[PDB]
Amino acid sequence: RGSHMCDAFVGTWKLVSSENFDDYMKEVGVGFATRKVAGMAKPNMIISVNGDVITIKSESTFKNTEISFILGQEFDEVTADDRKVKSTITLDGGVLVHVQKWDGKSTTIKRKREDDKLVVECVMKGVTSTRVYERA
Ligand SMILES: CNc1ccc(Nc2ccccc2C(=O)O)c(-c2ccccc2)c1Cl
C-alpha cells in the first residue's frame, strides 16, 4: 500500500491547549467529578493507519481509550466519560469528522491538521471546545 492523505494524522501527539472543555462536557452531560478529573488530564493521542483501518489511542492519567475504525462504517465506542455511543467517522476535505450518537443526543468531533498541530474541535448544541495537540 502507498501513502494516503490521512497519513498526515499519523504520529504521537500531546495536548498543549484546551478551551471551553468544561462547558462542552457539561453540555454532553458529564457529571461533576468526571468533569473535574477529566479536565485536568493532558492526554497523549497516538494515531496509526494500517490498510483501511485507522486507530486512535488516547493515554492519560484519567483514562486510556482506543478506537479502530474504517471510514464511513459505524462502530461501537465507549467514551472516556463512560458513554456507550454509536460512532461514524468520515473524511471531509481533509478533516476527520466523528459523529457520536447516544440516548437521542449527538456530538461531533472534528480533527484537523493546522501548521504542525492537530486541532480537535468538539461541538455539542452550540457549545464548542477546541483542544490543540503538538507532536510528542
Ligand atoms: C464528554 N467527555 C469527553 C469527551 C471527549 C474527551 N476527549 C477527546 C475525545 C475525542 C478527541 C479528543 C479528545 C481530547 O481529549 O482532546 C474526553 C476526555 C478523554 C480523555 C481525557 C480527558 C477527557 C471526555 Cl471525558
CB under 8 Å to 44, separation ≥6 — which residues? 12, 13, 14, 15, 58, 59, 60, 136
Q: At which residue does the C-alpha cell 443526543 appear?
A: 105
Atom 17, ligand 1: which residue's CA is nearest?
80
Q: Which three cell numbers stand for residue 70?
A: 474504517
Q: Tell me the domains of the chain and their CATH numbers.
A: 1-136 (2.40.128.20)
Task: Give the Cβ contact number of residue 110 at 10 Å.
Answer: 17
- CA dist 79 and 24 (Å) reads 14
> Which of 18, 32, 44, 81 to probe ligand 1 with, by most ligand atoms within 8 A of CB?
81
Q: What angle do CA 42, 29, 23 make, to 5 degrees?
A: 55
Burial of 33 (0-12, 13-18, 19+ CB in 10 A): exposed
The full length of the chain comes to 136
Q: Which three cell numbers stand for residue 92?
A: 471531509
Q: At which residue does the C-alpha cell 478551551 appear?
A: 19
Asked if residues 14 and 133 have their Cβ atoms less than 8 Å apart, the reply is: yes
Atom 12, ligand 1: which residue's CA is nearest?
120
- CA dist 8 and 62 (Å) reads 27
Q: Which three cell numbers stand for residue 73?
A: 462504517
Q: What technique determined this structure?
A: X-ray
Beta bridge partners of 130: 19, 121
Record the resolution, in angstroms. Answer: 1.5
Alpha carbon 6 to chain centroid distance?
15
The Cα diameter of the chain in Å comes to 46
Asked if residues 131 and 43 have their Cβ atoms less than 8 Å apart, the reply is: no
For helices 21-28 and 32-40, angle between their N-to-C axes, nearest 10 degrees: 150
* Ligand 1 center to 2 CA (angstroms): 31
- CA distances to 54, 61, 107, 122, 128 from 101, rounded to whole Å, are 20, 26, 7, 14, 17
